[PDB]
Design a protein around this ligand. Structure first.
Ligand SMILES: Cc1ncc(COP(=O)(O)O)c(C=O)c1O
Lengths: 401, 401
């Protein structure tokens, strides 16, 4: 019959708009600063050498394709927890955590959202920083939670509004949920420094808030897996039992294979088995059991010393290329005669950078220079290469001079 | 803390318990008839030759691991639509269908369920047959719909309660949702014959019911992909715009890779685009995009003549082993001197068989013969092999005589 006549055409994604225009452009100097995945120095997708080798191992073993347990590959969940909490972590060693494999970071955040909706009886409010990854809204919203926000980004300085953040967080009703980015805040790239993190943890402890860490870039951010997980670990050291989402999309370049994990820090191993049974019950009617390919690759790497070692070098390489590009962009802006302060470009961390450009300026950048970005002045640093950093520098100077 | 103290231990999975108790048994005669996946004649997992050939082809190309679009691999979704509807299906050729890649059968069912909750304004009720796959319930329940039922299985004769089905469907409120298993009904193995399907279509047409088909065993049930898709194709052909879920778990043996799809039959190409946009809005906050490996493997086989040709041979090979084991069970039961009527075993279709055995008899089989199965009397034919079929007939005879 005519069941669907009332379904309206959904709104178009702006990122898709930028990508389509970029593809149409004929100018060979075109840059795509809307990319959400790492690109090497030649602007190409990069499959890690350690993933090629792990894949090669799998094939040689003639593995079956049987269904994985609901919670996922045990070797993968254990390794994920170890990676995040630290091998000599008290939480890890006493077994008071529960980790289940999720569909990358997004599926892992959703399982968590769904878990909180069902069992977190104290509140339905989730406080997100201003701004946050766009998908974070519909994720918590479709799950049944209420969205709240706390000040985070300071447009005046293109850095942390520490004063605004501490004031907001201090007024959060106790036992509410606060979403924190572990590192490489998406989309601004501004992260608290260690001393700021110490103040932040004191207050969440004091106000007895449930801390939900989104850790989508461990290793990929600064090049150091322990450094990137520092604030998460500090929070747990201070006695804050968090919930966390992990993604292997960026740090292992496993994008389409969807490898990720969801973890809950419990009081003890007893309590962990209980929440693990509830997590299994929720997941079965969602998708029954997780996709095995990304987890088998991730597991092999983390668990095989030779591989793990090669992985840390390559993840460091990715991080270093991006720091390199941020470094190069501010020196070339000085070189061009920009009198403006571009240090936020080097203070920011990870793949996304909030530049401070205004909408008028990004339009000119697109129209006249064939540099494609979203109107919020957000740039994907994976889109810059050694061959075009100078150009971008030039282009930025011209629209801000 | 003490966020999770009130979270209790969830109930034990009864399938888990049979498999597990099966493991703990020492008897060299032991048999696991609770297995949910195909097993060869030696009781081993079976990865198809055609899938090993596709995996080598993917390996040779050195493909990237970039994210697939939200809706999935286009070569996969089109081929999936084509296998279900038929190449010269009117619905296929006009392009009045929308096919989205889902996480195997279960995630496909669930995005479907969530789509209905959000856009099916006509009703909140879904009518499942009595009985249906266990997971069908939480799927719809967690999605937000209300469960209802229609008589299906006749315990008295271990066949279809055709009359009861027809009376129950005739009375379903107009514009209700009805779930139909396209073939090889789970868990009984009882399917309507071609003429009863015809009669069912007309009532569904008359009551103006939204028919949701669950097609998890296309090709794997009878050895023939067209015959297995007969009922679906008939409904579309009579002008019933159906909703469908497909799984490649069993027919391609892709279990853990998670390849499946969800399709909606629309009025035209224009409406298909509107519904496709909303489905994307829905999936994004669920898991962002689907896993690429299973979809890549399945797209190659379906799209490559030589591989598709091989695949058809293997799926038939699987269906025949199953039919052979059904046939041999009945003959051995007769040979044993059993006087009960066991024709239902040969009348049933697919991997699952409702034997008619009572709880205490199942218990007798477990305790004295080392035969593991659920207390509902359902056996998974995959666990029967040429070398133990004799044994199984004998035990069943001893317990029922
Ligand atoms: C803040 C943030 N969270 C989570 C993710 C997870 O993406 P995926 O679903 O590929 O794991 C990303 C990157 O897309 C992200 O930037």
């Amino acid at each position: 019959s005519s069941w669907w006549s009332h379904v309206e055409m959904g709104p178009p994604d702006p990122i898709l708009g930028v990508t389509e225009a970029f593809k149409r452009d004929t100018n060979s100097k075109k840059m795509n600063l809307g990319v959400g995945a790492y690109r090497d120095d030649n602007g190409k997708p990069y499959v890690l050498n350690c993933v090629r080798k792990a894949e090669a191992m799998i094939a040689a073993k003639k593995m079956d394709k049987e269904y994985l347990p609901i919670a996922g590959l045990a070797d993968f969940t254990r390794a994920s927890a170890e990676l995040a909490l630290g091998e000599n972590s008290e939480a890890f060693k006493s077994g008071r955590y529960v980790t289940v494999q999720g569909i990358s970071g997004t599926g892992s955040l959703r399982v968590g959202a769904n878990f909180l909706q069902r069992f977190f009886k104290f509140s339905r409010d989730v406080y997100l920083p201003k701004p946050s990854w766009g998908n974070h809204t519909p994720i918590f919203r479709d799950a049944g939670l209420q969205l709240q926000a706390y000040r985070y980004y300071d447009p005046k300085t293109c850095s942390l509004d520490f004063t605004g953040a501490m004031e907001d967080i201090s007024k959060i009703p106790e036992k509410s949920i606060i979403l924190l980015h572990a590192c490489a805040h998406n989309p601004t790239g501004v992260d608290p420094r260690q001393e700021q993190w110490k103040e932040l943890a004191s207050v969440v402890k004091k106000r007895n808030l449930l801390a939900y860490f989104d850790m989508a870039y461990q290793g990929f951010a600064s090049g150091d897996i322990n450094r990137d997980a520092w604030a998460l670990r500090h929070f747990i050291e201070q006695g804050i039992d968090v919930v966390l989402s992990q993604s292997y999309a960026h740090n292992m370049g496993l994008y389409g294979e969807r490898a990720g994990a969801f973890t809950v820090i419990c009081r003890d191993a007893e309590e962990a088995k209980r929440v693990e049974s509830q997590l299994k019950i929720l997941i079965r009617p969602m998708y029954s059991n997780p996709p095995m390919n990304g987890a088998r690759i991730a597991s092999l790497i983390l668990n095989t010393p030779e591989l793990r070692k090669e992985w840390l070098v390559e993840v460091k390489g990715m991080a270093d290329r991006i720091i390199s590009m941020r470094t190069q962009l501010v020196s070339n802006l000085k070189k061009e005669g920009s009198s403006h302060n571009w240090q936020h470009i080097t203070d920011q961390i990870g793949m996304f950078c909030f530049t401070g450009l205004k909408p008028e300026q990004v339009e000119r950048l697109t129209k006249e220079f064939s540099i494609y970005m979203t109107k919020d002045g957000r740039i994907s640093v994976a889109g810059v290469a050694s061959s075009n950093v100078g150009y971008l520098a030039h282009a930025i100077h011209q629209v801000t001079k």
